């Protein structure tokens, strides 16, 4: 288990290797590098911080693919347990929640949230009406128009 | 002065940030090293930054918030009191909602003058509950107490409001008064008699209650009986407004 | 250890109230009976802090000290040895 | 100025329903008015039954107190969980005045005021159907003045709030009336906490006095769930055949109803009411709970109803069961929508059936109909009925499997958006903390554009440094930390954007300009924090250190 | 009752006097020399003593005493519904009132550290005075809410954040606890609830909070066993 190993040694090359197996953009990868570098002397297990950083960035960058396909959300963490050498998935989401405290309110995290238009899993135009307590907020008990359209196209493909 | 604490949030952060700092680890930095600023340049820079910094996002957000105005009107017609809260001044929002929107809608739906709006500036420390009830008795003309209803050195305001509650239960449910309360958790209106008076007025279905709160601990003011009487629907309206009107009663130099 | 029935807390509460009533105990820093009717009227409209906390936590002081009890309690009493520390 | 006044009245200037047009504004106004009137009949049908239930609570509760109050000591009644709102009645009993005396803690600062108010009320009530002294000699002279015997019923309201020394001395005072042969005294105590909390505050001789004849009465609405079940059943019979209730909604109702004990019924009424308002305000299919609107089918109704997952499951089961493709494309509907919205949905009538069978045929009364309805919704009614050890022989008669009907998602009360949580029971201080910390979920990011783009609003920027700091903050070091985040060049360019303001242009070319601007903005945000309650000055005349008061996530 | 008991199945005066001396011998240490308290005890225990009078007992005083011996071992002069949030707020207020605020991280802190640091070590040596025998200490609102959050009971858990935050129900329950005077303040009239100068303290004894904690199956004694 890579999350158990205390005071371990790592370089930026391993960080780029982890960030290139998730196909993140390069600026986000160097911001992950800088975020590890400004905390590197004070982590009991730096792989905990790195795991939370890449998981929180890969939730944000592919928010549209996660919206149109939830199984990607069941893929990515299921892939990353293969890289942290852990069988249970609870420590990975614990890493996500523990790192989430340390980067919320940071300027680059907020700019990433703005430019991908992703604030805790939804766009601004939905979160403003859930914050206002609107009765007309787009609740999710039906399916969206894009999901309905791609499902209708897929079922018309498999009909003939 | 960032803390050397492992935690930030929850009780973990609360217990981790309340540790003991040694005397040599403290900073003896004072206000004498700050640049000297007079009142006039304070006023000049504040009214410049409060009128040009982030004004366009505040304008667009405020145009989003008036799409909530029919839902606010519908919640007021079903007997709920509106409580607004958030970061920033909510005074302009409350007067714009109650005067420019809500009173003509109530007056036209009850068909010729519009509904009177009684404004309570709870940010004013001189807000007095007896004079507010004097204005209410001029606006609503309730029946005066008889001799058996005065009890024995009772509070005449509370007994008169209880008589008003017993009267208005058998009246048509048409709104006769719009009570706007800016800063319901303000320095004098947060007291127990003022809150009791306002919750018993909120019992009456013919008075619409639109209130705002600024303190982070404002729901501590209301127990089960006052929460039942107030009948609040809560609405978060954060706008990061300057709040320059409410700051005139405090000293910004201190 | 060296028999006497040990009474429970609920029964000792009545003995405690009887000892307060017989002026063996006195509430801490209590003024008591005021000098004039105006001071008594001012006191009667004040809510004292001792009247709201539970009875087991009220501070009290002795009107008779342990040395005086050793002076008065006879030698043949079964609690005479505990009038010394 | 009106802004500097204590209060002022504005007679607005007058230069028609709050429901809006749905279907992206393409709904007709006829459907909007029909939704309005439909909501009004549903709300009236629910609230008439609720008013009748509340009146029956009042009538039966006065009946129980009147039974316990009648048929040389006090007659003591302890009303547990009372909340002291009920009007207690006394009968007409000839040759005897029955006088009822209400006392609150506000009317009881000392024993003298208790006796003076009690004898004033006694004399006023005796005169209502030569001045006297308002003391206990009015009690001993009552048969000399008025000729009949006296029965005083004292009702102490909010007994957990009255000073107990005053109440003990008042009971000891009222003990003096036992030597008069024409006086009987009843005491009614509105106990809110429990009886053991009351007797630990009274003296032991007073408890021995009160022990001669006392009656306990649980007067709460939680006892037996008899009044909550009637309100929930009234809501069910309002929406029977029209609307469904989700298991999430009923679980939310139970979880919120557990958190409030003294005021349970009107919280339930408020929650059901707000769910009904939310449904009739957000859903254009509400007109289809009336069968006369089935000619109001348009296109946008069809594309909204085609995204139902029950329709999704039904058509994929249809392509599982039907090999040819011609019948599948014909459905992908308007006529098929009509024939299924008139289904009976007999779960409400069966819930009434098991309710009356549990109450009147098995003599079991301690059941929550809301919890029973939740267990019937999730399919575990047998696991709810196997507790009393008497429904074992009736386990097979009361069996019910849930039928996940088609297009029930357009007619249901749910909470999967958190609207009921954000409106009725919000996380108030958590919402304030999260709006301060994040702030990009509040203010839009439109793309002084440069300074708005690269500098935060001042309160959020102050909160970001506030949260990462210690309990005790130096104000000057806080200002130094706040000044480092600000842009030193773009702010000085921003205050030079307006050439009309001359004093700001004069102050901009000062060599100490940026520090002055930073200190002004910092001080304004610090006083905003102080007014919100986030910080506290731990002094009176220095104002050099502050203490953190609020932590995010608590 | 006595003349009903003799028909259901000087010496009457003998058995009444014997009951009076038995009451005095059982309860003189409790009542003292109070005529009134012994009169109440006689009135309370006379019908329960009459109800255990038999033909074998009417002329045998020692056997009649042994038949109704329960009336003389206990005085029995007594008269013998909060929310879950109110119950845990009362427990947390008792904890705040009787534990000093410099060791809470040594009891309640449990969460995994990403940043290097140390929690509180704990109290070094135990005190030999039980602090619940004294008056309660004063605390702030946020300490009470922090300890209440600590002691309240607990891929879809990723978006859960399973920790209860102080919403308006918690503050409403706290205000209800204050208006019932199970919590108290430093001032009693014209109370400024929102001032940071106003502090809070518990207002229940140990027995009340003990039966409250056993009502919710909370181990409140485990926070007091190691401290003294």
PDB file of C-alpha atoms in Angstrom, chain B residues 10-180:
ATOM      1  CA  UNK B  10     -14.850  20.771  12.078  1.00  0.00           C
ATOM      2  CA  UNK B  11     -14.120  20.016  15.729  1.00  0.00           C
ATOM      3  CA  UNK B  12     -10.743  18.640  14.596  1.00  0.00           C
ATOM      4  CA  UNK B  13      -9.754  22.101  13.369  1.00  0.00           C
ATOM      5  CA  UNK B  14     -11.345  23.735  16.416  1.00  0.00           C
ATOM      6  CA  UNK B  15      -9.269  21.644  18.834  1.00  0.00           C
ATOM      7  CA  UNK B  16      -6.135  21.841  16.670  1.00  0.00           C
ATOM      8  CA  UNK B  17      -6.116  25.635  16.309  1.00  0.00           C
ATOM      9  CA  UNK B  18      -6.712  26.354  20.028  1.00  0.00           C
ATOM     10  CA  UNK B  19      -3.248  25.411  21.242  1.00  0.00           C
ATOM     11  CA  UNK B  20      -0.817  27.386  23.417  1.00  0.00           C
ATOM     12  CA  UNK B  21       1.583  29.964  21.957  1.00  0.00           C
ATOM     13  CA  UNK B  22       4.714  30.851  23.925  1.00  0.00           C
ATOM     14  CA  UNK B  23       5.629  34.465  24.686  1.00  0.00           C
ATOM     15  CA  UNK B  24       8.672  34.437  22.391  1.00  0.00           C
ATOM     16  CA  UNK B  25       6.524  32.901  19.629  1.00  0.00           C
ATOM     17  CA  UNK B  26       4.010  35.755  19.833  1.00  0.00           C
ATOM     18  CA  UNK B  27       4.239  38.905  17.717  1.00  0.00           C
ATOM     19  CA  UNK B  28       4.321  42.317  19.402  1.00  0.00           C
ATOM     20  CA  UNK B  29       3.145  44.130  16.265  1.00  0.00           C
ATOM     21  CA  UNK B  30       0.824  47.058  16.927  1.00  0.00           C
ATOM     22  CA  UNK B  31      -1.450  49.499  15.108  1.00  0.00           C
ATOM     23  CA  UNK B  32       1.192  52.242  15.388  1.00  0.00           C
ATOM     24  CA  UNK B  33       3.110  50.690  12.473  1.00  0.00           C
ATOM     25  CA  UNK B  34       0.036  50.916  10.237  1.00  0.00           C
ATOM     26  CA  UNK B  35      -0.157  53.794   7.729  1.00  0.00           C
ATOM     27  CA  UNK B  36      -2.191  56.695   9.068  1.00  0.00           C
ATOM     28  CA  UNK B  37      -5.573  57.116   7.370  1.00  0.00           C
ATOM     29  CA  UNK B  38      -8.018  59.964   8.006  1.00  0.00           C
ATOM     30  CA  UNK B  39     -11.815  59.774   7.776  1.00  0.00           C
ATOM     31  CA  UNK B  40     -12.116  61.608   4.446  1.00  0.00           C
ATOM     32  CA  UNK B  41      -9.751  59.368   2.471  1.00  0.00           C
ATOM     33  CA  UNK B  42     -11.402  56.347   4.124  1.00  0.00           C
ATOM     34  CA  UNK B  43     -14.776  57.570   2.831  1.00  0.00           C
ATOM     35  CA  UNK B  44     -13.346  58.347  -0.624  1.00  0.00           C
ATOM     36  CA  UNK B  45     -11.646  54.965  -1.160  1.00  0.00           C
ATOM     37  CA  UNK B  46     -14.602  53.035   0.305  1.00  0.00           C
ATOM     38  CA  UNK B  47     -17.210  54.690  -1.919  1.00  0.00           C
ATOM     39  CA  UNK B  48     -14.915  54.227  -4.925  1.00  0.00           C
ATOM     40  CA  UNK B  49     -14.367  50.509  -4.284  1.00  0.00           C
ATOM     41  CA  UNK B  50     -17.987  49.873  -3.283  1.00  0.00           C
ATOM     42  CA  UNK B  51     -19.241  51.335  -6.582  1.00  0.00           C
ATOM     43  CA  UNK B  52     -16.733  49.955  -9.132  1.00  0.00           C
ATOM     44  CA  UNK B  53     -15.131  46.752  -7.756  1.00  0.00           C
ATOM     45  CA  UNK B  54     -17.178  43.648  -8.722  1.00  0.00           C
ATOM     46  CA  UNK B  55     -20.181  45.828  -9.604  1.00  0.00           C
ATOM     47  CA  UNK B  56     -21.098  44.009 -12.831  1.00  0.00           C
ATOM     48  CA  UNK B  57     -21.164  40.472 -11.259  1.00  0.00           C
ATOM     49  CA  UNK B  58     -23.238  41.914  -8.394  1.00  0.00           C
ATOM     50  CA  UNK B  59     -25.635  43.464 -10.934  1.00  0.00           C
ATOM     51  CA  UNK B  60     -25.980  40.194 -12.869  1.00  0.00           C
ATOM     52  CA  UNK B  61     -26.462  38.205  -9.643  1.00  0.00           C
ATOM     53  CA  UNK B  62     -29.121  40.678  -8.494  1.00  0.00           C
ATOM     54  CA  UNK B  63     -30.921  40.200 -11.819  1.00  0.00           C
ATOM     55  CA  UNK B  64     -30.858  36.448 -11.130  1.00  0.00           C
ATOM     56  CA  UNK B  65     -32.348  36.993  -7.648  1.00  0.00           C
ATOM     57  CA  UNK B  66     -35.495  38.824  -8.843  1.00  0.00           C
ATOM     58  CA  UNK B  67     -36.592  35.655 -10.653  1.00  0.00           C
ATOM     59  CA  UNK B  68     -37.266  34.412  -7.092  1.00  0.00           C
ATOM     60  CA  UNK B  69     -39.740  37.268  -6.477  1.00  0.00           C
ATOM     61  CA  UNK B  70     -42.959  35.391  -7.517  1.00  0.00           C
ATOM     62  CA  UNK B  71     -41.916  32.431  -5.342  1.00  0.00           C
ATOM     63  CA  UNK B  72     -41.371  34.850  -2.430  1.00  0.00           C
ATOM     64  CA  UNK B  73     -44.826  36.332  -3.085  1.00  0.00           C
ATOM     65  CA  UNK B  74     -46.350  32.834  -3.168  1.00  0.00           C
ATOM     66  CA  UNK B  75     -44.646  31.887   0.110  1.00  0.00           C
ATOM     67  CA  UNK B  76     -45.964  35.073   1.732  1.00  0.00           C
ATOM     68  CA  UNK B  77     -49.558  34.369   0.640  1.00  0.00           C
ATOM     69  CA  UNK B  78     -49.506  30.926   2.299  1.00  0.00           C
ATOM     70  CA  UNK B  79     -48.602  32.373   5.702  1.00  0.00           C
ATOM     71  CA  UNK B  80     -44.841  31.860   5.823  1.00  0.00           C
ATOM     72  CA  UNK B  81     -42.533  34.621   6.999  1.00  0.00           C
ATOM     73  CA  UNK B  82     -39.538  35.264   4.772  1.00  0.00           C
ATOM     74  CA  UNK B  83     -36.103  35.236   6.384  1.00  0.00           C
ATOM     75  CA  UNK B  84     -33.257  36.345   4.140  1.00  0.00           C
ATOM     76  CA  UNK B  85     -29.620  35.740   5.017  1.00  0.00           C
ATOM     77  CA  UNK B  86     -26.258  35.780   3.321  1.00  0.00           C
ATOM     78  CA  UNK B  87     -22.985  37.643   2.992  1.00  0.00           C
ATOM     79  CA  UNK B  88     -23.467  41.349   2.332  1.00  0.00           C
ATOM     80  CA  UNK B  89     -26.149  43.980   2.709  1.00  0.00           C
ATOM     81  CA  UNK B  90     -29.710  42.841   2.070  1.00  0.00           C
ATOM     82  CA  UNK B  91     -31.351  46.232   2.685  1.00  0.00           C
ATOM     83  CA  UNK B  92     -31.720  47.329  -0.956  1.00  0.00           C
ATOM     84  CA  UNK B  93     -32.978  43.844  -1.872  1.00  0.00           C
ATOM     85  CA  UNK B  94     -35.662  43.959   0.833  1.00  0.00           C
ATOM     86  CA  UNK B  95     -36.959  47.454   0.015  1.00  0.00           C
ATOM     87  CA  UNK B  96     -36.863  46.745  -3.741  1.00  0.00           C
ATOM     88  CA  UNK B  97     -38.782  43.484  -3.245  1.00  0.00           C
ATOM     89  CA  UNK B  98     -41.353  44.804  -0.774  1.00  0.00           C
ATOM     90  CA  UNK B  99     -42.022  48.264  -2.227  1.00  0.00           C
ATOM     91  CA  UNK B 100     -41.401  48.095  -5.979  1.00  0.00           C
ATOM     92  CA  UNK B 101     -42.723  44.534  -6.412  1.00  0.00           C
ATOM     93  CA  UNK B 102     -44.682  42.950  -3.563  1.00  0.00           C
ATOM     94  CA  UNK B 103     -47.057  45.720  -2.456  1.00  0.00           C
ATOM     95  CA  UNK B 104     -48.511  46.413  -5.973  1.00  0.00           C
ATOM     96  CA  UNK B 105     -48.946  42.654  -6.533  1.00  0.00           C
ATOM     97  CA  UNK B 106     -50.803  42.227  -3.228  1.00  0.00           C
ATOM     98  CA  UNK B 107     -52.894  45.360  -3.858  1.00  0.00           C
ATOM     99  CA  UNK B 108     -53.843  44.371  -7.420  1.00  0.00           C
ATOM    100  CA  UNK B 109     -54.573  40.758  -6.446  1.00  0.00           C
ATOM    101  CA  UNK B 110     -56.929  41.963  -3.673  1.00  0.00           C
ATOM    102  CA  UNK B 111     -59.340  43.812  -5.979  1.00  0.00           C
ATOM    103  CA  UNK B 112     -57.267  52.443  -4.579  1.00  0.00           C
ATOM    104  CA  UNK B 113     -53.972  52.664  -2.690  1.00  0.00           C
ATOM    105  CA  UNK B 114     -51.217  50.101  -2.286  1.00  0.00           C
ATOM    106  CA  UNK B 115     -50.386  48.154   0.875  1.00  0.00           C
ATOM    107  CA  UNK B 116     -48.397  50.190   3.440  1.00  0.00           C
ATOM    108  CA  UNK B 117     -44.887  48.929   4.159  1.00  0.00           C
ATOM    109  CA  UNK B 118     -43.643  49.520   7.696  1.00  0.00           C
ATOM    110  CA  UNK B 119     -39.832  49.471   7.708  1.00  0.00           C
ATOM    111  CA  UNK B 120     -37.897  48.522  10.849  1.00  0.00           C
ATOM    112  CA  UNK B 121     -34.210  49.466  10.841  1.00  0.00           C
ATOM    113  CA  UNK B 122     -32.915  46.853  13.261  1.00  0.00           C
ATOM    114  CA  UNK B 123     -29.344  47.953  12.581  1.00  0.00           C
ATOM    115  CA  UNK B 124     -30.302  51.160  14.420  1.00  0.00           C
ATOM    116  CA  UNK B 125     -29.640  50.609  18.161  1.00  0.00           C
ATOM    117  CA  UNK B 126     -32.459  53.066  18.985  1.00  0.00           C
ATOM    118  CA  UNK B 127     -35.118  50.802  17.441  1.00  0.00           C
ATOM    119  CA  UNK B 128     -37.856  50.808  20.083  1.00  0.00           C
ATOM    120  CA  UNK B 129     -40.581  48.176  20.275  1.00  0.00           C
ATOM    121  CA  UNK B 130     -43.238  50.439  21.836  1.00  0.00           C
ATOM    122  CA  UNK B 131     -42.947  53.095  19.106  1.00  0.00           C
ATOM    123  CA  UNK B 132     -43.046  50.355  16.451  1.00  0.00           C
ATOM    124  CA  UNK B 133     -46.276  49.101  18.020  1.00  0.00           C
ATOM    125  CA  UNK B 134     -47.537  52.704  18.115  1.00  0.00           C
ATOM    126  CA  UNK B 135     -47.020  52.916  14.343  1.00  0.00           C
ATOM    127  CA  UNK B 136     -48.680  49.493  13.962  1.00  0.00           C
ATOM    128  CA  UNK B 137     -51.725  50.644  15.961  1.00  0.00           C
ATOM    129  CA  UNK B 138     -52.015  53.739  13.766  1.00  0.00           C
ATOM    130  CA  UNK B 139     -51.751  51.571  10.635  1.00  0.00           C
ATOM    131  CA  UNK B 140     -54.175  48.810  11.688  1.00  0.00           C
ATOM    132  CA  UNK B 141     -56.493  50.573  14.246  1.00  0.00           C
ATOM    133  CA  UNK B 142     -57.056  47.631  16.631  1.00  0.00           C
ATOM    134  CA  UNK B 143     -59.678  47.571  19.344  1.00  0.00           C
ATOM    135  CA  UNK B 144     -58.434  48.900  22.670  1.00  0.00           C
ATOM    136  CA  UNK B 145     -58.236  46.675  25.731  1.00  0.00           C
ATOM    137  CA  UNK B 146     -61.142  46.485  28.145  1.00  0.00           C
ATOM    138  CA  UNK B 147     -60.538  46.571  31.894  1.00  0.00           C
ATOM    139  CA  UNK B 148     -60.591  42.788  32.353  1.00  0.00           C
ATOM    140  CA  UNK B 149     -58.039  42.382  29.529  1.00  0.00           C
ATOM    141  CA  UNK B 150     -55.470  44.702  31.148  1.00  0.00           C
ATOM    142  CA  UNK B 151     -54.943  41.992  33.844  1.00  0.00           C
ATOM    143  CA  UNK B 152     -52.808  43.359  36.729  1.00  0.00           C
ATOM    144  CA  UNK B 153     -49.813  45.473  35.600  1.00  0.00           C
ATOM    145  CA  UNK B 154     -49.579  43.429  32.424  1.00  0.00           C
ATOM    146  CA  UNK B 155     -47.721  44.348  29.267  1.00  0.00           C
ATOM    147  CA  UNK B 156     -50.368  46.216  27.274  1.00  0.00           C
ATOM    148  CA  UNK B 157     -48.538  45.698  23.961  1.00  0.00           C
ATOM    149  CA  UNK B 158     -48.460  41.897  24.272  1.00  0.00           C
ATOM    150  CA  UNK B 159     -52.057  41.684  25.532  1.00  0.00           C
ATOM    151  CA  UNK B 160     -53.217  43.944  22.686  1.00  0.00           C
ATOM    152  CA  UNK B 161     -51.398  41.749  20.148  1.00  0.00           C
ATOM    153  CA  UNK B 162     -53.006  38.631  21.662  1.00  0.00           C
ATOM    154  CA  UNK B 163     -56.410  40.326  21.340  1.00  0.00           C
ATOM    155  CA  UNK B 164     -55.434  41.179  17.743  1.00  0.00           C
ATOM    156  CA  UNK B 165     -54.593  37.511  17.080  1.00  0.00           C
ATOM    157  CA  UNK B 166     -57.960  36.418  18.468  1.00  0.00           C
ATOM    158  CA  UNK B 167     -59.680  39.065  16.318  1.00  0.00           C
ATOM    159  CA  UNK B 168     -57.906  38.412  12.994  1.00  0.00           C
ATOM    160  CA  UNK B 169     -58.527  34.641  13.077  1.00  0.00           C
ATOM    161  CA  UNK B 170     -62.131  35.294  11.942  1.00  0.00           C
ATOM    162  CA  UNK B 171     -61.314  37.827   9.208  1.00  0.00           C
ATOM    163  CA  UNK B 172     -60.710  37.393   5.460  1.00  0.00           C
ATOM    164  CA  UNK B 173     -57.105  36.417   4.755  1.00  0.00           C
ATOM    165  CA  UNK B 174     -56.114  39.554   2.846  1.00  0.00           C
ATOM    166  CA  UNK B 175     -52.753  41.136   3.633  1.00  0.00           C
ATOM    167  CA  UNK B 176     -53.231  44.562   5.224  1.00  0.00           C
ATOM    168  CA  UNK B 177     -49.636  45.385   6.218  1.00  0.00           C
ATOM    169  CA  UNK B 178     -46.142  44.511   4.985  1.00  0.00           C
ATOM    170  CA  UNK B 179     -43.638  44.480   7.853  1.00  0.00           C
ATOM    171  CA  UNK B 180     -40.068  44.741   6.577  1.00  0.00           C
TER     172      UNK B 180
END
